[model samples]
Target: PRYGFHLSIAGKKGVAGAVEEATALGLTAFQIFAKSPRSWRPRALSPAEVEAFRALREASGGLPAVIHASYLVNLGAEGELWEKSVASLADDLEKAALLGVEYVVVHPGSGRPERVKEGALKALRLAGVRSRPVLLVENTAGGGEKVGARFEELAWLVADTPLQVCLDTCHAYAAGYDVAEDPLGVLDALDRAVGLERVPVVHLNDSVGGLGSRVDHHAHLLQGKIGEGLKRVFLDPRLKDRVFILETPRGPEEDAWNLRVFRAWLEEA
Candidate 1:
């Protein structure tokens, strides 16, 4: 259980359910969405809702929690889309702060497939709005016109905006970074470009797609191309204490099994 010592949690699950499961599995952290990931409309969290979630956290023995924004939001889109994306994101951040969450992770939408730079810049500006919680820019799989596929692109985005980087391994490899051979190199480049201290959280996932495929197929840990490579990074001493959430595919038993496997690997390392 040495490797499993690091905090691990499920994404997109209900807040209460996640806490229950995390406690049962002895996990130290978990992730959840403030609203539906597929919709653009914002749903305000009632005071009762906040209290209920806070209660769960306290009952879980101080396990950490993170909130991911709606996936449909395109913070980089121009005109109306950009406006809506920003409004939604700002609202999400406010709600997250009220809930007392530590971080809010978001995917920088493709800048209309033509305005990558503009989209990135705008996304950063919007994310920088005053808030109690930190906003982390998630790297996309690059499939279609997704943004933040390359480190340089993300570095530039961070340089121009107020948000920090999230660094999803599956998305980086899917977008063609060869994470298996250059895990540290990727981290170093990020540091050189945006400062290592900027990275507050890490999304540890194995890619189902081939290098540079741009597909968002996340497989279980040690079951895909970047399997062993990812394990090495997770076990690194420097990465200790940062939130490492497994966004891999899972069913009932497979979910906990992957978490246990990752935990074991970390210990052995």
Candidate 2:
């Protein structure tokens, strides 16, 4: 199962280090930052580090990896920020291509329909090429007038921009989807609204806030509102093969516990 946790960044470790850490608990896949996700200005990946990462990755039995773009890189914006945003994306895409990464995640910030669509085209053009790594647009919590909050508005965002959807469980819960009542029901809505085949990634997070709260926070698995819903998610055949990326907390111990509990639920399913 490529169902694994994101690497803990607080510790200075190599790519294989996190892969080994995740595999210890029977997890295999991982998501990593190609560079500092907070900073718009990122350090370059050295020639040796690139080879080292690729070598370790191959030795690890070709573990599937996803590269999460910088938090500050929002392509749906105006002026200099958007310029820096595209530049940063270009770096990540290049890195993804070099390291044999398959998917990359980006936060689709807010703007009008036409503006977002036009700006995304320009951004990807500036980012060189959209070759290997499939770029994924994540659903937001309807916060800050986020663009891809609802499925209807996603037509433009997903249209010519050619961005697939990445469903975040916590974001949907915060946006008022009562997933705990019927997890498959939510999936049904998604399939009706947006084609299910377009959604390849699932950020399996739990929300501390109640439904419709629109809060941005991740809670420990089964410790938050959507606890039971996630189990249903695993049980439902619809999401059995989706890429499950757990983003609980930035600690090895906490992620280990989340993986353990999640695996039990998977077995239960």
Candidate 3:
């Protein structure tokens, strides 16, 4: 169980600060946004900042780190949005490669399934980022034109591209998987459709909505709709060595409590 949180980049140290914070919390892994998540423009990371981050992370027990791409990126959209999405992804890949991050995760966005698939593939080609910082398309809570909520949709998105997956537990539950009742069954379907091996990271979150509610709200462990069923996710041998990151609420105490609960559950299991 490689557990950690999606740490905030609030201080002057840039992403290097997140590494430091995670180390302080005794976390074994972490995730971050390479740039402002809500904005389309990305702030350039200086050479010194990049070099310092690499050195710090290498020294910090080589804990795995991930970059969550900006929210503005919508690969499913066309024209201007598509161009920005492609450019943003290319920049994210480059940053991840430089910072020695393991994966870059992005939402498939809202649109027709086939169009999203084609857009994702085209974006990957246009970005031309090979190897390092493997791009992962995350599953969403189904509603409207949102794609990749189903395993088959995810399978198609990753079909012809050099891409992988970042399975969000909350999203899975919201998408009608009933993860609290049968996580393994959901995982089995995921394996059958896209191969569980393709999933390198799991977003360990409890949903705020009821099963199949299709809401994206996240709650604290054991304090949400998913409840104790999340333990199976930790004990699953297939995901044992993979990254499990928490996108729970903010505040130092909140993060500390969640990490403590995560460790205790794994230990007890």
Q: Show how many residue pairs clash in every candidate, following the order shown.
A: 5, 0, 0
Model 3 scores a C-alpha lDDT of 0.85
Best TM-score goes to which candidate? Answer: 3
List lDDT for all candidates, in order: 0.70, 0.73, 0.85
Model 1: lDDT of residue 7:
27
What's each prediction's TM-score? Answer: 0.84, 0.90, 0.96
lDDT measured at residue 164 in model 2 versus the true structure, 0 to 100: 76
> Can you write out model 2's per-residue Cα lDDT over 108-214, one digit (the tens) per residue?
77666565666556655665656557787777788676777776666557775567777888888888777777678878888877777888788878889878788
Task: Give the Å shift of residue 135 in candidate 2.
Answer: 0.6
* Candidate 3 to native Cα RMSD, angstroms: 1.4
**What tens digits encode model 1's per-residue C-alpha lDDT throughout 36-119?**
677777666668767877798897676767777777778667668777776777667777777788777888787643354455
Candidate 1, residue 265: Cα displacement in angstroms equals 2.1
Indicate which candidate wins on lDDT.
3
